[PDB]
């Protein structure tokens, strides 16, 4: 408990250092901001564009041309700006579909990571998921996914099952693992060697049907009791 | 210095047989980066090569572990923009505004779409 | 100044509200533009004073309705409009 709590505290503390030192850690939200700003800027820029007209300002068009002659120029400018605004609306719709997909993903991640625990691989961050925390952002959500990663692995020799009394035993959980001299049952993700007994193994069939089966003692706790 | 790539001809970079995790992608598996004093192009490195020790009787199990925290970022909303047809289209002038009526219900469609996007953000 | 008026400054026709400005034009610049070429500021041809060109107040109006089946009362929301004016 102490070591795990200290590790969690250290990681949470280093999150701020990583966020501040990184040049573009928040690049994804800044991308939406920049996309909106650029769309608006280009939409405004198109106003200065002449679209083939004698000028891009309506007052001069109405001044130095008769209404019958200026009507074509007005029609050209109006159709050009209508097309520009329709293009803006279409781009907004496409980006809104993308944002809706992202928001649905964010809601699903909230529900699964924060409101529960996710068995999905690489969904609530990379690694064996524990939990997550949401953090508010100007136009998004930042998830502080807490994950579990194995470390300090070591080699071992194993067999699928243990044969005893002419019958094969298989583990309820974990693997049959030995450093080379003694056989122990160990859980997969943290080396916890258990003594091999009937408590953590179940029998199935005779021993000749299993490839690579090995022999070792399987203590019965009732025998020492001798009730 | 001139080099040839499937994406085209590259001038000003020297090709180096070394493989690095690359910064600037050019194409066809060729990237470039600052050598340090020069610009170098090279084939991408997809990471280290690891012949994991497979065997019919060997296992590797973690004797320890680490609990780590990583930050994921996802946008959720965008700016709720509103547009006025008359002012943008022709700058709030009467002569132009009079003619704009002839084009029909475009603005109703555009404003409906923008309002739908705005409500979708909320 | 300080009210919406149609203005013509040695040309440069436009409409807006005029206010004194602190931006310092160079001795040869007649008028200024903001991002995307909005006629942000102008210099008075006669007094040589510097004046901003602020667009006249505008905004969308939205009507709050409790349902015609319920009542005919309504409230109007002037988006972007300060209550110091209309």
């Amino acid at each position: 408990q102490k070591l795990i709590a200290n590790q969690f505290n250290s990681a949470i503390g280093k999150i701020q250092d990583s966020l501040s030192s990184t040049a573009s850690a928040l690049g994804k939200l800044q991308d939406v901001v920049n996309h909106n700003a650029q769309a608006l800027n280009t939409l405004v820029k198109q106003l200065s564009s002449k679209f083939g007209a004698i000028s891009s300002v309506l007052n001069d068009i109405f001044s130095r041309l008769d209404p019958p002659e200026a009507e074509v120029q007005i029609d050209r400018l109006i159709t050009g700006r209508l097309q520009s605004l329709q293009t803006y609306v279409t781009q907004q719709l496409i980006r809104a579909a993308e944002i809706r997909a992202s928001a649905n993903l964010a809601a699903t991640k909230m529900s699964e990571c924060v409101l529960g625990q996710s068995k999905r691989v690489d969904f609530c961050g990379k690694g064996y998921h524990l939990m997550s925390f949401p953090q508010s952002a100007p136009h998004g959500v930042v998830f502080l996914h807490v994950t579990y990663v194995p470390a300090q692995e070591k080699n071992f020799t194993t067999a699928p099952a243990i044969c005893h009394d002419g019958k094969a035993h298989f583990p309820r959980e974990g693997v049959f693992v030995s450093n080379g001299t003694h056989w122990f049952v160990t859980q997969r993700n943290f080396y916890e060697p258990q003594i091999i007994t009937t408590d953590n193994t179940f029998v199935s069939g005779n021993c000749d049907v299993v490839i690579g089966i090995v022999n070792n003692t399987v203590y019965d706790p009732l025998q020492p009791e001798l009730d | 210095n001139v080099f040839q790539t499937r994406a085209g001809c590259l001038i000003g970079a020297e090709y180096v047989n070394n493989s690095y995790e690359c910064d600037i992608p050019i194409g066809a598996g060729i990237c470039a980066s600052y050598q340090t004093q020069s610009i170098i192009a090279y084939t991408m490195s997809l990471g280290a090569e690891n012949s994991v020790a497979y065997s019919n009787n060997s296992i590797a199990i973690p004797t320890n572990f680490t609990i780590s925290v990583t930050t994921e970022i996802l946008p959720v909303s965008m700016t709720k923009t509103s547009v006025d047809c008359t002012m943008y289209i022709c700058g709030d002038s009467t002569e132009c505004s009079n003619l704009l009526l002839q084009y029909g219900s475009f603005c109703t469609q555009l404003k409906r779409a923008l309002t739908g996007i705005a409500v979708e953000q909320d | 100044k300080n009210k919406c008026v149609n203005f013509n400054f040695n040309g440069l026709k436009g409409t807006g509200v005029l206010t004194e400005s602190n931006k310092k034009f160079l001795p040869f610049q007649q008028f200024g533009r903001d991002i995307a070429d909005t006629t942000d500021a102008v210099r008075d041809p006669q007094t040589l004073e510097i004046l901003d060109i602020t667009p006249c107040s505008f905004g969308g109006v939205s009507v709050i309705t409790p349902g015609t089946n319920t009542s005919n009362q309504v409230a109007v929301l002037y988006q972007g409009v300060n209550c110091t004016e209309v």
């Binding site: 501040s20 928040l26 939200l29 | 943008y88 | 905004g59």
Partner: peptide, 22 residues
């Protein structure tokens, strides 16, 4: 802090403010 930002174009405010999101 890390992320930062008429002619007929205006931006409406979101229904949920930053304080309520927090």
């Amino acid at each position: 802090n890390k992320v930062t930002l008429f002619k007929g174009l205006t931006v409406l405010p979101p229904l949920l403010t930053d304080e309520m999101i927090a």
